[PDB]
Design a binder for this molecule. Sequence first.
Ligand SMILES: Nc1ncnc2c1ncn2[C@@H]1O[C@H](COP(=O)(O)OP(=O)(O)OP(=O)(O)O)[C@@H](O)[C@H]1O
Ligand SMILES: Nc1ncnc2c1ncn2[C@@H]1O[C@H](COP(=O)(O)OP(=O)(O)OP(=O)(O)O)[C@@H](O)[C@H]1O
Ligand SMILES: [Mg+2]
Ligand SMILES: [Mg+2]
Lengths: 861, 863
Amino acid sequence: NFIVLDKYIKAEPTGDSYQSESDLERELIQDLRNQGYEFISVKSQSAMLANVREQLQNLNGVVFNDSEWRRFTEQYLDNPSDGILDKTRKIHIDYICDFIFDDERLENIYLIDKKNLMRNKVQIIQQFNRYDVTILVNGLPLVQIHLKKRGVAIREAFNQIHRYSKESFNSENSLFKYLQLFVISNGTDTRYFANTTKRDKNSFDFTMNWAKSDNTLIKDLKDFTATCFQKHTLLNVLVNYSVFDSSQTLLVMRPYQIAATERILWKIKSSFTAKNWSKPESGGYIWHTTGSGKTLTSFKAARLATELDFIDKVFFVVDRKDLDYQTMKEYQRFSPDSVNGSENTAGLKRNLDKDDNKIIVTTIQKLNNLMKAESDLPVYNQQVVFIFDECHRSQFGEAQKNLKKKFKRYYQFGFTGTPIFPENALGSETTASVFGRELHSYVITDAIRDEKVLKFKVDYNDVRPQFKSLETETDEKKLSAAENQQAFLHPMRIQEITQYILNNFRQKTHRTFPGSKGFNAMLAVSSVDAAKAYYATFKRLQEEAANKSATYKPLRIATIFSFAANEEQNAIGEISDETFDTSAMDSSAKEFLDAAIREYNSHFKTNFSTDSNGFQNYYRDLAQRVKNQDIDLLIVVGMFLTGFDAPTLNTLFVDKNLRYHGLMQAFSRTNRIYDATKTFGNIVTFRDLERSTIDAITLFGDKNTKNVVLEKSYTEYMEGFTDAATGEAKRGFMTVVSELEQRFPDPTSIESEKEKKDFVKLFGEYLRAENILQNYDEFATLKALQQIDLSDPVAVEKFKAEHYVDDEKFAELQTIRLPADRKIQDYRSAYNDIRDWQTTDWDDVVFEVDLLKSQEINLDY
Amino acid sequence: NFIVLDKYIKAEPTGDSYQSESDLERELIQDLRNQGYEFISVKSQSAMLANVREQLQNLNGVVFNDSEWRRFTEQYLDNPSDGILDKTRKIHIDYICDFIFDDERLENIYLIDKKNLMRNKVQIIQQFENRYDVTILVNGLPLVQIHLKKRGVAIREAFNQIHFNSENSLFKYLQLFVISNGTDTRYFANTTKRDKNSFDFTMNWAKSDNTLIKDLKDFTATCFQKHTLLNVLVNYSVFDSSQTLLVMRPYQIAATERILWKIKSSFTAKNWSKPESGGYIWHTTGSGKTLTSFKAARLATELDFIDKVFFVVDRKDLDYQTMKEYQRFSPDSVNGSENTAGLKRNLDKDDNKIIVTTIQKLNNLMKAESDLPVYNQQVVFIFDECHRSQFGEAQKNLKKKFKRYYQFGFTGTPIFPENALGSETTASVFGRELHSYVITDAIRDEKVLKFKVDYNDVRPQFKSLETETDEKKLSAAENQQAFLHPMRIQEITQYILNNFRQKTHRTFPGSKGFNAMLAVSSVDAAKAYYATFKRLQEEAANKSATYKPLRIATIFSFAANEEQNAIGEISDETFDTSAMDSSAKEFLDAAIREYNSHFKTNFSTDSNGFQNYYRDLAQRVKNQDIDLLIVVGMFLTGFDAPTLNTLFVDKNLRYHGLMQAFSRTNRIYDATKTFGNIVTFRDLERSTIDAITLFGDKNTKNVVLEKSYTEYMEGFTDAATGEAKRGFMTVVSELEQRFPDPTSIESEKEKKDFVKLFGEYLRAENILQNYDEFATLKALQQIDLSDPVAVEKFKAEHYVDDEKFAELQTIRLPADRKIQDYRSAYNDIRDWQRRETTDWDDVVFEVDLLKSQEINLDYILGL
Ligand SMILES: Nc1ncnc2c1ncn2[C@@H]1O[C@H](COP(=O)(O)OP(=O)(O)OP(=O)(O)O)[C@@H](O)[C@H]1O
Ligand SMILES: Nc1ncnc2c1ncn2[C@@H]1O[C@H](COP(=O)(O)OP(=O)(O)OP(=O)(O)O)[C@@H](O)[C@H]1O
Ligand SMILES: [Mg+2]
Ligand SMILES: [Mg+2]
């Protein structure tokens, strides 16, 4: 019974008023009642607890006495020391209470029946100005629906609730700590999101629309109720399509993630019933674009496949190059000490012999090595499921041959963001030929439309005339031959590239505002020699800057690299796999790496050795420190470029010849959504990759996909353009600056309620434009210009050579009239003065909360 | 192959200087080498770790690479964040490291082989970097450390010399300490628990007849035999739920191995289900029966041929610590209820042999069930003092239903023919006495304290009732006209309130002291007393804003009557509060609500509520949150509270019940707790002597009972040790004559002589604090230069006439300031002695008594 519908006929409105919260509330309660949700009147936690007692007793076939009920309540159901995370843990992991009754007998008390989902009781209650419907599961408040007036903007509604994170609890409301899901609606638009204490997942960007399997949205509250709020749909979303990970983050899956998972599950059942196993028609493949949640989804799909009573083993297979701190932490819980960068199979052989267990997490490298050496494994004759998460190739081809030869009853599935088509299978087997049919898809154009993945701002930094010919070279033989100190690794090119990165790092990563946290960056390079050259030049130029200024704030730079198997004899599209056996590297490489590791150790007070165990532990710690921004810039060759998840990484500096799938995978390191401060990922290249970018985008889309994936120009954001995909006109920053000065020249004078509303709407566009434009070198150069003031013999230029601007460009730039930095702060404080205060409609008005919050709070020193 | 020897031929000296630490060291290293201990030279932890690597590799048949060894070291062997407790936990519980090698293979790395003890490597080392110490290494781990002192040095002063430290972190693994001077050799556990760190907890090695092995050479030839030491470290050491390491005493080890041998014997000879299959242990009250029997039970589970081991306790003996311990082995099944659900469930648990239950629950189970698979299994029963009531019935069904069994009993007061009371004798039930450790032996060994027993004859109006011996009359006098008369209760309560602090050593400024219990005749008495305490304490708070009230609590339930007659056995109280009369239940709820308000607890009136109240109460009496606990028959037979020193008695205790109740005060603590005070308001002098004599002989009373006031004031000769003990007044006179004050103590010989004399002053005054006569004398040293209000207050409060008051004024005691002068001078000599002619060898300072009289900064800060 698919819960992400193939087809759905839109419901028709009742001729009754549908404008106020009460109107939305009445129809919500009515449709839910029509859909099997008993409406009950509760006006206290005492009445809520009495109802929980009835449901839990009913569900478990037990009757508590008052003493036993009070004891269950205080020790398991509503412990006063329990927070939201404890309740999430109780719903998703510890949902069974081993309860000892007064007669000393043991009873297993379930909060939810997860095997027979429809056995659970579902009820609805209403608020006891804050119009809310709550869905109760066995009396527990698991879903809360916020209803707002039709005119109110859903983003401001959501912002008003997250305004103050002072979510305090008491003995009269502590049952609400059990909430798993929130739904915010205004009638026309309806968005859902997880109840999580993790502020890094609490922005509007993580709110989701319900949808159909073709990924078309279900925005209308009435249609949302008729689909998402069906008992069978909601209970599956809460119990099976919600993840509570090792970091104690609750994640509710998006419709596309649910659509792919149930279609894989259905296909295993189908192929088993029809005895049609061990064929490409037994499994299938999923095309979910890079960064859309493939690693989240496939692992959950694997875990749900273990629940199929007829299945014996479920292999969840990842490429070791995609491993990072968070995924390694997660896999450690299921397959201890067996998912790492080594070639060892001992862990895999041990996990396979574990009884009362079906999940096997391993790498494609370890699975290949096992199938090579072993031929008498009992697993080969068992009913086995394979879930491959982006297992690229190199090792996958060999792995497929032994798999088809040794495994007798299997269903294999693959998840990929960049499939192998014939047009890029000139030295590989296609996704379709390996796996069979495309079970579900969620393409980059769908992800961008949904704001579930960010766009790319891609630019070649053409500011080195001496080296342009090398940097614009298209011949493969010439590019590989130019990997030396006379060509690409020339001290002056490396000094020029590094000096640009040091001067523009803070601009690119939004660290320019004083109290602003900002983002961090990565630098992907051509070779181990390039990695060496850059790390050295960064250290040199940074040591030089610390001498010339005691006010200098250095950046924490790190590097990691190993030996690439096919660096000489390969292609150009696939990023070369690096071994975890450091003893394969040349003496100077190993020497340089140890020197960098010792500097890392001294700074972070760590003791990572040079050996295999040492490097593996260094890889893990490095991944975590780049993700939490302990490291400002990570220098890499081919590592942390295909699976590394870092939502606060926004800039990728590139001095490498990236092509097709490798280009998409690498650029996508910056594509994670965060909040309004992260508008897109910056791609700054020192080799011309404009053609390679368009070729890569077009391969996993069409001729138009580049207009959606790539960000617009500086002139366009300064003067205005019309988005082709949305059909709407976006006002240019200069148009907004002009209107701000004409309509509101105010020294503090402001005006009426109509002017205040008009200003908030205007300055909101300003903040959104200024923040988007921070990512533009042209805008940075323009903003830097507003600083000088001199007369007769004194200090001049410097700006020209640092911004690579001639005397002609510098002449016209002075004519550009921008508002004074104090007037912007006057507008920023005038805007903040209208923060809340408590005619003219303030309904459709949205404040830039995330963009504002980049203020000057407790940075003091 | 017993490690507590039935016979041992004393070794002869080598005839070589045996006087200095070096002499003792050479012979120790030599005898240990002769006994299979390889002597190795180690001068650093690096050399110590290299040796650990060799031993652990050898033992486990594995070879670490340097990366794997550094990883094992940092993550399991020598974690920098690990303390002594972590290492104790690793030796006794987590001794197997599930190690993942660089090739991803799993290996179970053992620190010790516990199944094949003799496979372990034993080595000896001596102090690296003047200190004299021999360390015994087990698989390279320093588990035993021997402190060697020269022959003249007093072992108590040598113990007072050494025991947080810091590094050479491998030494955090030490389990046992041995302190010797050649002549005397004592061992003790390495524990971070200061309440178990006094000299009182150091032990001598011994033979199964409990005769001591004091000589270091004989100690080495017995305790330090590889097979003996390794068993002591691995099998005869307890690391409990409170993370306290306890090394068993020889008698506890002797009883346990004799029970274990007997199970093997009877099994091999197919001679099960007979009294000749098991046996019984006579270990006096408070000697460690609950520690020993439970360990004996757990070691019996290691017998591959045994299927189930029942460790059976009386619910009456349960307290916070034992309940906490049993919860780990038999969750939610060892409590005061009648329920068998927990027991049935623990019995059905696979990969488990230990069953902890109560005699009440086991009886109820055997009554209702007859088709249990356990009845046909090879089963061991260890009964820890199951106060024979439900036991008789339990024995009937046991012999009937269990087909292959070995039953053992542990008791401090056995059932002899002279005290059968309807119940069959210990010998007829269990068979032969496998081991014994009598009160005489415990007192001699200072493993149990003596009793100071006295009838407070200060109520002439009520004496005839209080001295009545007729059973019918005593039971009839349980009313408001006789025993529960408001005046008698006011008089008894007023005495307790006025003398509580004196009895419990809370008088000196800054002293923690002890707490007390009041055992009463009936629920009506409990009510009367709790009410009078509240009344008299509310009256005192009004009459003074300087009044410091006492935390008083009470607990009681319903018993029965003359069920199986007796006044000797303490009547069992049910945990079913619904059986109580309305007024009792009413009063108890009122007291529980007052308790709840004070301690911020929420114990309800129901069964679950009362059970939780019992548990919390036990912990608060043990940690002294409660100053006085008022009881009828609860916490009188098994409650362990080493800081409880006084038992006020307004109850007719006889024989086993008298011994069991008085023993609540018998736990050893330190030098400040010389004996347990028994203050009775009913004459129990004959009952006391009758009870002592029943579990000893006609002379046992001279050992168990403390001497009189006059004797401690003027001197007496200890019959048991043949030694003359100087009286407090003789010492006071010698102090004034031989040391007028801070001049004379100028020479090295005068200092030594003053330390020996003042030591005795501190010891005698602390013994004498427990005497009403001495308290009255000390109280007189303020009173007046005319104030008839105070003179009359003194006389009435100390129940002193005009004649006694006349002579008491002639007693010339030293000035309070002069005592303080002697006390600071004494500390200055101790301070100067640690900083280092006359010989200071045999000199012992009163460290524990000095520390209680220090008046530290964590007290003077009072505003
Ligand atoms: N359902 C969801 N709810 C909330 N956050 C989500 C959801 N799906 C994905 N995310 C978050 O989005 C980020 C990207 O997800 P993930 O790493 O699984 O992507 P991916 O498609 O496998 O990426 P790549 O192609 O780089 O390997 C993660 O931080 C993840 O936790
Ligand atoms: N080997 C030992 N080392 C240290 N302390 C010990 C040892 N044996 C007993 N003790 C301590 O002595 C005290 C009395 O022990 P325990 O309660 O087991 O005595 P018992 O014989 O069962 O007494 P009772 O007759 O009152 O039931 C406890 O605090 C216990 O921890
Ligand atoms: Mg991924
Ligand atoms: Mg006991």
